[PDB]
């Protein structure tokens, strides 16, 4: 070394020539994956959905104000949304019993995701033939359901002016099929954020933010003195 330079720290003293990885296959991974995606789009047609994923908060205070897609809905979020956990995996919903319910806000946020998905979902009959039971039973209770829906319409008409179903019905009907590749791109994680405006009052004007920060800090560091004094 001569003249002014940084102290060099290069880990090339080993055999790097056998540790060299080159990305000449990068342009062809794109073709291989895209083609496999298209064949995946068929076979399971329609709804090659990558499964509906929950809305979860990123870990740590560095990221906790952001939402991101988790893995699988908890059993309570499915029960709140009135979805059978056995049927959920077959209609493109990810399920994760490993995840514990973290907060009420998480439970409500991810139960609304399932409710929106179930309304946007169209399930085709297990048997295409028109004599399938579900299509047959749809006509059988079509007369009865009309009276059943009569009071529900007026249920939400007077009040809005525990008996809650354990499971909601699967939306099963015959329709012209339109394929959407991923349902997480249809149901947004969060709404777009606009400028927030608030009324300025004397109550907020006089608030001492720094004093509350110091008091919270000082109270945390004062628990050590209490224990020492108590043992004295």
């Amino acid at each position: 070394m001569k003249h002014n330079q940084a102290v060099s720290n290069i880990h090339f003293c080993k055999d790097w020539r056998s540790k060299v990885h080159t990305w000449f296959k990068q342009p062809f991974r794109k073709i291989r994956r895209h083609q496999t995606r298209v064949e995946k789009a068929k076979a399971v047609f329609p709804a090659t959905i990558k499964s509906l994923k929950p809305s979860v908060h990123c870990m740590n205070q560095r990221f906790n104000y952001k939402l991101r897609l988790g893995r699988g809905f908890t059993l309570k979020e499915l029960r709140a949304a009135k979805i059978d956990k056995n049927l959920a995996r077959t209609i493109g919903i990810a399920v994760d019993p490993r995840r514990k319910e973290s907060s009420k806000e998480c439970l409500n946020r991810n139960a609304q995701r399932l409710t929106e998905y179930m309304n946007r979902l169209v399930v085709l009959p297990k048997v295409h033939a028109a004599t399938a039971k579900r299509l047959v039973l749809n006509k059988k209770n079509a007369e009865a359901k009309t009276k059943k829906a009569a009071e529900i319409k007026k249920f939400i008409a007077e009040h809005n002016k525990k008996k809650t179903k354990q499971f909601n019905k699967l939306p099963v009907q015959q329709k012209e099929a339109k394929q959407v590749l991923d349902a997480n791109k249809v149901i947004r994680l969060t709404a777009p954020c606009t400028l927030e405006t608030k009324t300025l009052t004397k109550g907020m004007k006089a608030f001492d933010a720094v004093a509350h920060l110091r008091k919270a800090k000082n109270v945390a560091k004062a628990v050590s003195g209490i224990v020492k004094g108590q043992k004295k």
Binding site: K2, S8, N60, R62, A209
Partner: protein, 148 residues
């Protein structure tokens, strides 16, 4: 571009610009940072005087996410919402709506107080506040809000 190297202008010169007395030999004092305390000590003293030794306590496993705290000065608060919004609420006061500058939404956690604020009331919402940051915000007619 190998045609612009010095090797193309030293063709015909015997030693290629490395000298006849002191040849271009393999080593010039060792390999790497060798001899940092014996014969390259004048180099380490001159240019990196605190290279050798210890200072401070070890952190066996550092959680560098706990020290993450981006900061914004008071002079840079209004640029988060733009000058258009700033001029819209230029004549606001106590009683009517005042724009809220959510620093956490923009990735800033602590508000430091450096520089000057335009003389408009403003609601600054953040996680931590400097001492002068709160004074400068209050003196302008605004309020300080805590988050998280």
């Amino acid at each position: 571009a190998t045609r612009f190297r010095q090797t193309r202008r030293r063709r015909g010169h015997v030693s290629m610009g490395y000298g006849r007395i002191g040849k271009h030999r393999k080593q010039r004092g060792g390999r790497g940072n060798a001899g940092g305390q014996h014969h390259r000590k004048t180099w380490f003293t001159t240019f990196h005087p605190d290279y050798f030794g210890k200072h401070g306590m070890r952190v066996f496993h550092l959680k560098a996410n706990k020290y993450y705290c981006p900061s914004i000065n008071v002079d840079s608060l209004w640029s988060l919402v733009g000058k258009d919004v700033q001029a819209q609420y230029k004549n606001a006061k106590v009683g009517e709506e005042v724009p809220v500058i959510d620093c956490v939404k923009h990735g800033y956690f602590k508000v430091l107080g450096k520089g000057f604020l335009p003389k408009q009331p403003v609601i600054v919402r953040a996680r931590y506040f400097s001492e002068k940051a709160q004074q400068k915000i209050k003196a302008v007619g605004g309020a300080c809000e805590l988050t998280a």
